[PDB]
Amino acid sequence: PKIHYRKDYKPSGFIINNVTLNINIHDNETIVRSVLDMDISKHNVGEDLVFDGVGLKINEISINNKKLVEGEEYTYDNEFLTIFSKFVPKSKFAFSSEVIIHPETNYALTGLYKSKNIIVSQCEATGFRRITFFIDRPDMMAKYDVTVTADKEKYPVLLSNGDKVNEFEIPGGRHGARFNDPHLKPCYLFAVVAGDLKHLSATYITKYTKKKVELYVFSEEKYVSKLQWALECLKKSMAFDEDYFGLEYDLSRLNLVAVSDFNVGAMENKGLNIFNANSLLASKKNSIDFSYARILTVVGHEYFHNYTGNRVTLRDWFQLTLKEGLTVHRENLFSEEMTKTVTTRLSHVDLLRSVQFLEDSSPLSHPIRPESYVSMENFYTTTVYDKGSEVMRMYLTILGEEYYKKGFDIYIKKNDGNTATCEDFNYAMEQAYKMKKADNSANLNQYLLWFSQSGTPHVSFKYNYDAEKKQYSIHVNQYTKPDENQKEKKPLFIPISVGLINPENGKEMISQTTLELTKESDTFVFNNIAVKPIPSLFRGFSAPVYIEDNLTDEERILLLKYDSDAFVRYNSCTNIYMKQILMNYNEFLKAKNEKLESFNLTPVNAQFIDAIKYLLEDPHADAGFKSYIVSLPQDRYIINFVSNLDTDVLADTKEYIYKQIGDKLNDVYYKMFKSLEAKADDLTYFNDESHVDFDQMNMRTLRNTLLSLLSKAQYPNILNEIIEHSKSPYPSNWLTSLSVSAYFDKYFELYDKTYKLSKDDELLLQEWLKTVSRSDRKDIYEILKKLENEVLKDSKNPNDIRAVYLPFTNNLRRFHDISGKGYKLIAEVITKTDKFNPMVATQLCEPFKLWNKLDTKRQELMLNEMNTMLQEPNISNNLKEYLLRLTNKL
Numbered sequence: 001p002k003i004h005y006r007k008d009y010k011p012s013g014f015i016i017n018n019v020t021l022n023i024n025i026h027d028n029e030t031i032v033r034s035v036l037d038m039d040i041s042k043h044n045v046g047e048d049l050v051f052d053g054v055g056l057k058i059n060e061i062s063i064n065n066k067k068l069v070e071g072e073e074y075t076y077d078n079e080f081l082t083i084f085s086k087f088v089p090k091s092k093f094a095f096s097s098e099v100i101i102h103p104e105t106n107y108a109l110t111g112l113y114k115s116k117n118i119i120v121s122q123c124e125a126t127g128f129r130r131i132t133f134f135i136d137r138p139d140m141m142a143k144y145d146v147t148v149t150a151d152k153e154k155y156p157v158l159l160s161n162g163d164k165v166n167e168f169e170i171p172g173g174r175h176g177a178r179f180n181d182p183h184l185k186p187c188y189l190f191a192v193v194a195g196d197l198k199h200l201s202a203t204y205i206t207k208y209t210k211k212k213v214e215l216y217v218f219s220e221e222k223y224v225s226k227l228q229w230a231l232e233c234l235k236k237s238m239a240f241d242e243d244y245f246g247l248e249y250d251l252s253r254l255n256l257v258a259v260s261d262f263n264v265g266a267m268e269n270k271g272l273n274i275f276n277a278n279s280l281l282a283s284k285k286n287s288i289d290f291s292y293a294r295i296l297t298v299v300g301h302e303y304f305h306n307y308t309g310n311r312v313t314l315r316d317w318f319q320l321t322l323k324e325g326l327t328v329h330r331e332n333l334f335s336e337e338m339t340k341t342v343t344t345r346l347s348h349v350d351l352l353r354s355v356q357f358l359e360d361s362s363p364l365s366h367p368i369r370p371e372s373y374v375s376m377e378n379f380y381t382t383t384v385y386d387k388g389s390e391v392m393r394m395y396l397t398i399l400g401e402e403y404y405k406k407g408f409d410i411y412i413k414k415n416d417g418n419t420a421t422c423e424d425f426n427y428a429m430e431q432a433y434k435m436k437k438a439d440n441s442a443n444l445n446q447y448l449l450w451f452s453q454s455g456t457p458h459v460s461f462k463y464n465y466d467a468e469k470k471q472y473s474i475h476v477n478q479y480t481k482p483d484e485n486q487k488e489k490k491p492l493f494i495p496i497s498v499g500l501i502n503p504e505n506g507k508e509m510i511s512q513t514t515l516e517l518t519k520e521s522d523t524f525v526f527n528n529i530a531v532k533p534i535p536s537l538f539r540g541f542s543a544p545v546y547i548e549d550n551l552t553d554e555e556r557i558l559l560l561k562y563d564s565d566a567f568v569r570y571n572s573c574t575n576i577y578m579k580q581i582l583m584n585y586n587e588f589l590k591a592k593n594e595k596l597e598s599f600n601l602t603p604v605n606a607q608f609i610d611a612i613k614y615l616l617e618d619p620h621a622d623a624g625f626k627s628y629i630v631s632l633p634q635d636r637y638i639i640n641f642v643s644n645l646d647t648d649v650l651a652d653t654k655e656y657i658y659k660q661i662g663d664k665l666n667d668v669y670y671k672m673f674k675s676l677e678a679k680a681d682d683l684t685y686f687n688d689e690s691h692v693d694f695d696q697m698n699m700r701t702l703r704n705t706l707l708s709l710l711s712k713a714q715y716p717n718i719l720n721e722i723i724e725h726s727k728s729p730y731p732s733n734w735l736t737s738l739s740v741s742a743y744f745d746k747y748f749e750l751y752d753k754t755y756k757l758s759k760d761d762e763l764l765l766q767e768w769l770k771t772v773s774r775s776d777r778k779d780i781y782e783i784l785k786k787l788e789n790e791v792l793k794d795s796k797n798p799n800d801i802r803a804v805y806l807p808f809t810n811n812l813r814r815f816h817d818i819s820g821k822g823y824k825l826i827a828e829v830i831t832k833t834d835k836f837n838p839m840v841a842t843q844l845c846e847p848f849k850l851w852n853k854l855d856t857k858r859q860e861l862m863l864n865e866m867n868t869m870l871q872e873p874n875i876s877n878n879l880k881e882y883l884l885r886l887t888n889k890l
């Protein structure tokens with residue numbers, strides 16, 4: 001394979017100052033004419049001029065109106081257009097090309113493509129080169145003048161980045177519109193849209209300069225009523241960036257557009273953000289609760305990119321985390337502020353410690369700033385995004401709010417209108433750090449290892465108390481496992497947010513403090529500690545690490561009950577469950593391997609179960625928090641602690657634990673399920689698409705979690721409750737009725753009822769597909785075959801493909817069937833999908849990431865499917881790189 005290395009970055013020998021496009025959309029072809037006003041840079045050494053250009057049909061090429069000819073002045077191999085250096089001018093010049101492309105057949109959803117009846121672009125990372133020739137890299141910044149023409153009847157709305165400066169009629173029923181984007185930008189931020197779109201709009205007045213900005217949100221006609229919450233969340237995002245960061249929007253207009261066919265969530269094209277319809281469109285009658293959270297976060301995310309990615313952009317793709325990690329952090333701060341519930345931060349932690357930690361212990365492990373790539377697309381990872389966000393968040397933890405805001409402002413101002421690197425950000429933070437410490441010798445040089453060093457640190461603790469001296473010490477060690485990226489690991493700068501809880505009364509003993517661990521180990525000593533404490537460690541999840549608290553289950557129970565920090569409470573509960581899981585897992589595993597006729601299991605701690613009941617029954621405790629405590633840790637979290645994992649033994653483990661707890665708590669669970677009904681399903685705001693009560697949503701989450709527990713338990717007469725729940729006006733409730741009915745004969749009747757309620761809304765049908773796919777059904781393989789034949793069919797919509805298959809892959813017992821038939825099925829779907837959408841094909845590989853953690857028979861089966869995929873002729877470079885890295889071949 002063809003490998004790019006971070007160390008080999010060099011500025012181009014060329015400059016592209018202005019781009020002038022004419023994009024003429026016809027029924028069976030789109031013609032792109034482009035003039036690049038170019039120059040020679042200070043770095044030029046008389047090299048050939050090489051443009052990226054993939055799958056383009058050339059009509060004409062010229063320089064300064066001189067036609068250039070293939071074989072004589074240029075070559076083109078379907079990937080790169082080479083102009084021989086003799087024909088490259090030595091000062092300012094105009095490069096012209098006209099090419100033909102075919103959006104109607106572009107099923108990879110990169111470049112210019114057709115989504116239902118909308119023509120739309122996606123250029124990040126390497127898609128602009130599929131539209132026209134460019135030096136397609138983020139340091140090549142230019143200004144854009146864009147004309148789009150099309151049939152007026154078919155495509156009455158035409159959008160590109162920036163100010164619409166003209167609109168005109170064209171003979172033969174066509175029309176045009178011209179856009180001028182005054183902000184310099186890399187080509188990955190170019191966008192165009194053409195369709196029969198409807199919109200909602202509002203005017204926003206900026207807080208400091210009082211600029212009027214027109215906000216438009218667009219969709220196809222059928223779903224225009226599903227746009228309101230998106231528009232509200234944009235207003236919220238604009239206000240937050242003003243209020244926290246002092247940042248105002250910088251154009252007269254901002255458009256958000258929903259399209260049905262999209263590879264990921266959304267894209268931050270300047271003044272023209274394009275979204276997966278699943279991350280922009282909702283209505284309370286036709287969307288599950290989690291849609292509202294998703295839309296809020298994705299609209300926020302794309303909005304926050306306007307500074308962290310757009311106004312300050314990337315020097316090169318190795319810097320991706322500078323924009324994504326930072327924008328995820330911004331989005332997470334925003335989400336926490338808007339939702340005002342502790343479950344928000346917990347959900348982010350849960351995602352990191354399950355999905356991102358698994359990736360970091362896998363053969364795909366990379367630092368948040370990678371050293372190399374074949375296909376840059378494979379580096380849009382949970383590591384880059386979510387671990388990057390936690391690295392971006394640690395600066396806030398270390399600095400505090402005032403000095404964090406100072407450093408961020410230094411960064412955003414110094415680098416405005418330009419490219420930047422991870423170092424520039426660390427430098428700005430270091431300036432703030434020097435001011436905070438009042439010491440111009442302080443530095444964050446060590447901090448850079450968070451960018452360069454892969455893997456998750458393990459942080460462990462020992463404690464000692466001296467009652468005569470009233471003195472307490474916390475001794476801390478960090479360790480990062482060696483891996484293929486560094487054979488020797490270095491200690492990081494780990495900030496440890498701590499409190500100390502009095503076990504006697506459950507109250508705080510110190511002002512919260514942030515310990516700055518910089519060595520491989522250190523002991524932190526506290527005076528005037530009047531009794532032996534229980535430490536409250538890594539409050540807020542203050543660094544992205546494995547925590548070994550070295551606490552007894554009794555001490556963990558006391559934190560779960562009485563500590564003030566939601567993460568530490570949650571983590572204490574997590575740790576009690578993990579100890580029990582590992583113990584019971586080993587018990588079942590030994591009995592299976594030894595063919596024992598009889599053996600013991602360690603029961604669940606009875607004092608823990610009493611604590612869960614105390615929490616659940618406390619009407620003033622948090623409903624979203626309650627849903628986390630009654631749930632075991634996610635399977636992908638658990639698998640980070642087990643080697644050679646027998647998935648069926650784990651499935652048996654989890655069932656034993658759940659049954660133990662339900663045998664004590666099911667009556668409490670029932671009583672709560674009923675008591676919660678009035679407040680949970682209250683219809684206040686049911687007609688208001690501008691407001692969501694997140695606490696009330698968490699109450700529904702808790703009710704549906706309890707209902708799942710009680711349904712799996714066959715609690716007496718619970719089928720009645722399930723039938724009543726299916727008549728709720730909330731889709732979150734009536735789709736839950738479907739999956740919980742899996743344990744009863746009523747399953748197929750509820751399957752039909754909910755299908756009928758879902759089938760006329762594209763996005764609701766997808767939620768129905770997921771609900772079926774994750775259903776705990778012994779006949780799930782036959783249900784999947786029915787979904788394929790009756791609903792999915794030959795759809796190329798990534799949302800449909802992902803809906804049908806990904807939830808099923810989380811079915812621990814059935815996806816991991818010892819025959820390998822799960823593995824075979826998903827490998828077939830990956831190979832099928834790779835023939836038209838390589839990016840979605842790599843997304844569908846996600847279940848294979850843990851292959852080398854499994855028992856040796858399941859390792860072998862997975863490995864055989866991965867090698868079969870790798871032998872597929874015409875495998876994409878995306879899928880081939882991914883799979884070669886994953887199987888330790890690259």
Ligand SMILES: CC(C)C[C@H](NC(=O)NCc1ccccc1Cl)C(=O)NO
Binds near residue numbers: 263302380
């Ligand atoms: C929606 C998320 C998951 C990602 C989104 N990024 C993109 O739309 N990037 C283009 C892309 C995504 C995934 C894999 C490859 C590529 Cl090039 C983003 O960061 N938008 O701001």
Ligand SMILES: [Mg+2]
Binds near residue numbers: 101
């Ligand atoms: Mg082509």
Ligand SMILES: [Mg+2]
Binds near residue numbers: 331
């Ligand atoms: Mg997010």
Ligand SMILES: [Mg+2]
Binds near residue numbers: 797
């Ligand atoms: Mg469809």
Ligand SMILES: [Zn+2]
Binds near residue numbers: 301323324
């Ligand atoms: Zn992003």
